[PDB]
Design a protein around this ligand. Structure first.
Ligand SMILES: Cc1cc2nc3c(=O)[nH]c(=O)nc-3n(C[C@H](O)[C@H](O)[C@H](O)COP(=O)(O)OP(=O)(O)OC[C@H]3O[C@@H](n4cnc5c(N)ncnc54)[C@H](O)[C@@H]3O)c2cc1C
Ligand SMILES: [Mg+2]
Ligand SMILES: [Mg+2]
Length: 330
């Protein structure tokens, strides 16, 4: 049995999703697995999307301030984890920010900042402590979500790719695959080891925050790890000389003003890395380091505006600088 390398990529969940696999299984078995990967991504776009009218999440949002809504166990577990990170981060990650983000999302499409009062009114409808998850303990009891606060809107944009990465890994493993690189719009899971037969860690790139994005600034060797990066220049609009990026500080209702240009989180679960990367970007370096003390199994890499890079002890030895303008502090 020979090792063969496969890759498939599609536009789905609003971005480029690619999976690369090394396997000695019959090719028809890899092909079936990859068919299922991209079917899952299509199906889940219709569960999770905050910017289609026809998703499960949109239907849930169209019921805020009313009665509990039944959701599948998958979505329920995602919401549970999201509310967990909202609590732990002190609301720096907030999965009930849709009132605010939708005010800004229209701002992107036409390069205009929301509106003082409107933005203030929106911030009153983002209390994630008013999302009530309940699931009976009897056989086959349904999972339900209640949005108690009128006009509150869920938006799982900052955790859904992680969730989907984790679900893809689980599917790959179900297909007896154990070597893959999953890349959902830059949200990476490195499953197993790659082949060089010599087995080697995956070398995950971290971009220059201000790059044209073509090339990484740094590379980190990892196994069985998600790598998720949040940054200040990944998605933004400009108006009157001011850049407005997509990661909102829930306290201000404006794009977060922070002391880091990017934060990359390394975790066994991509769900966690995705939430935490967004939380840490909002929180800034010192407060991030205190939060991450809560999560001893996670590592982190910060790129500062002066191009210094600090990485936690679990990963610093695995970092290689490719763009010599950056400096890795040790
Ligand atoms: C299922 C699905 C379907 C999608 N469909 C589309 C599409 O059709 N078209 C398209 O252009 N993009 C789409 N996206 C991408 C989506 O709009 C993201 O909102 C955006 O690209 C940012 O993701 P990130 O992973 O780069 O950043 P992250 O930092 O992981 O997430 C930032 C996003 O989370 C939300 N948010 C902002 N601030 C906070 C915060 N403090 N706490 C929590 N959440 C916050 C906003 O939605 C913001 O865009 C989709 C994503 C998913 C999961
Ligand atoms: Mg995120
Ligand atoms: Mg993300």
């Amino acid at each position: 049995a020979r090792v063969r390398e496969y890759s498939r990529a599609e536009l789905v969940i609003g971005t480029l999703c690619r999976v690369r696999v090394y396997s000695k299984r019959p090719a028809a078995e890899v092909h079936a697995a990859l068919e299922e990967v991209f079917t899952l991504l299509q199906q889940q776009e219709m569960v999770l999307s905050a910017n289609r009218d026809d998703s499960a999440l949109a239907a849930l949002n169209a019921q805020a301030g009313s009665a509990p809504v039944v959701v599948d166990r998958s979505l329920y577990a995602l919401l549970e984890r999201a509310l967990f990170f909202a609590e732990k981060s002190g609301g720096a990650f907030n999965p009930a920010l849709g009132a605010v983000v939708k005010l800004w999302n229209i701002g992107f499409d036409r390069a205009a900042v929301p509106d003082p009062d409107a933005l203030k009114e929106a911030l009153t409808r983002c209390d994630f402590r008013q999302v009530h998850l309940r699931a009976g303990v009897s056989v086959g009891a349904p999972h339900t979500v209640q949005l108690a606060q009128a006009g509150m809107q869920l938006d799982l944009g900052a955790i859904a790719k992680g969730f989907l990465a984790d679900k893809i890994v689980q599917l790959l493993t179900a297909h007896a695959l154990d070597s893959a690189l999953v890349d959902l719009g830059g949200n990476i899971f490195a499953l197993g080891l790659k082949y060089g037969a010599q087995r080697l860690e995956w070398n995950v790139g971290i971009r220059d925050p201000h790059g044209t994005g073509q090339k990484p600034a740094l590379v980190v060797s990892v196994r069985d790890c998600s790598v998720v990066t949040s940054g200040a220049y990944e998605r933004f609009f400009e108006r009157d000389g001011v850049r407005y990026h997509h990661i909102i500080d829930p306290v201000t209702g404006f794009p977060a003003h922070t002391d880091v240009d990017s934060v990359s989180i390394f975790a066994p679960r991509s769900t966690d890395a995705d939430a935490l990367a967004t939380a840490c970007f909002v929180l800034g370096y010192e407060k991030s380091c205190a939060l991450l003390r809560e999560f001893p199994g996670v590592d982190a890499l910060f790129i500062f505006p002066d191009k210094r890079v600090r990485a936690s002890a679990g990963i610093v030895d695995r970092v290689r600088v490719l763009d010599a303008r950056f400096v890795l502090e040790r």
